Design a binder for this molecule. Sequence first.
Ligand SMILES: Nc1nc2c(ncn2[C@@H]2O[C@H](COP(=O)(O)OP(=O)(O)CP(=O)(O)O)[C@@H](O)[C@H]2O)c(=O)[nH]1
Ligand SMILES: [Mg+2]
Length: 514
Amino acid sequence: AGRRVNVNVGVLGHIDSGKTALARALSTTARERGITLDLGFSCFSVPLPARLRSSLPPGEPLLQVTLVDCPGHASLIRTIIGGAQIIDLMMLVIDVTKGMQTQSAECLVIGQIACQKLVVVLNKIDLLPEGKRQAAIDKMTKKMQKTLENTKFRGAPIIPVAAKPGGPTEAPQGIPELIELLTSQISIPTRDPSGPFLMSVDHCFSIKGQGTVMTGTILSGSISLGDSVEIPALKVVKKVKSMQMFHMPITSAMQGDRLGICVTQFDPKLLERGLVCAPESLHTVHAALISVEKIPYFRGPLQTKAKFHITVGHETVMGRLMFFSPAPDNFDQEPILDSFNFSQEYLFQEQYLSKGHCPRQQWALVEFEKPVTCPRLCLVIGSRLDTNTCRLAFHGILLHGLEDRNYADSFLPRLKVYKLKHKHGLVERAMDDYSVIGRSLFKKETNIQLFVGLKVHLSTGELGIIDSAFGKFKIHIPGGLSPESKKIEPSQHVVLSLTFKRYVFDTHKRMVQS
Ligand SMILES: Nc1nc2c(ncn2[C@@H]2O[C@H](COP(=O)(O)OP(=O)(O)CP(=O)(O)O)[C@@H](O)[C@H]2O)c(=O)[nH]1
Ligand SMILES: [Mg+2]
């Protein structure tokens, strides 16, 4: 054959929509095994569109399209997410008799947060009776355009096809048109091989003679023979002996390609799936600062200290969250997605602010239950997996990873997150025109000596300065109690305003007033 370019194209959808029947139906045009438990890979070749010659590194050039057939069962969502990080376009498959099902929504949300283009595929069309057939498709079609109105796939194509007519042997319908649409729809990114080398491994096995082989998809950069790769899951660097692709051995490879690499033998079952990359370029983290955006279909709040499933790149782990927002002086401030500013203060938030117009950017502090090796600025997704609604809660960017395991002692002091406290108490007696003995606002943590000098305010409107305790505590009022207060059945309360920095001022016991 001739020279070719690979594009990875996923197949997503509900639990029985025909994703595997359609991936197979597409490869045979250009048997029926059970449900799908991990990413299935197959491919087909097609003449290269003239608009893609700018991406090529005898026969007419070809476009090879790797199908990435995903699972559909709901227990396996953490794989569907991993498969979306290796594709460019995605086919969402719809059981045309059933429309959007529970995982069709989840897979679309994934699509908005990972891939660039979408194609909707209405399958199981033989099920429809020919009389009410074409009339029904237009309803489902129009229902889909509406469903995609809000999203970034607003004008995405919608194709009808029957990947296996009749139940579980006729011929599959509408496949030559779907191959031609994918061909016109495929867009190709920059494909620049400069930067870090990163590769997602989907299969690993030993060949008794020549080492251990890893097939997978290059996400970043380039690699050539002789290079060394780190395998973080084993904490060992190995040398690249051999590389094959398109049934031929090669010497180099760049982002977007899918190949197999041969290295010195290790135990393959030690790295089933996972990442591989240029040595000492991924960082392991116990915690991280990541920007947060809520996902709308998630009927529910996002509460600080709640526990989520967090997908950091291609590895998911549990973590507890602590949200925060800009200093209210900077709600209108631009969102920053590539860095984190530590020269500013941040308002603690017991909950994410979902629409008092909300802020343009919010953040969080993920504290992982186990370390996570991951790239910088990767993509974070939160979810609630441990019904019949969206389980995907939020998404964002890994803006700053904390590699020290003592980040709480060693590094957090740099993060100016303050809680805004505002407490209420009563006044009892007056011991002078400038004294006042009020109380009933503090707790059994009567460390009142912690506040001896802080400004307080009374319902009358005079600025008291706290003194020592007497039980209960004393106050000074340099301005003299007001007449209205001297008379005082009315009561005349007090209010205190402090900022409690969660870690910053934490190193100490006293709070901040300003
Ligand atoms: N009647 C009819 N059934 C179809 C058609 N296409 C697929 N099916 C049925 O869909 C059922 C499940 O689809 P299958 O491809 O096996 O799995 P899937 O769609 O990838 C969903 P998962 O991978 O989670 O099992 C199959 O048993 C098959 O009989 C079709 O065109 N007409
Ligand atoms: Mg399947």
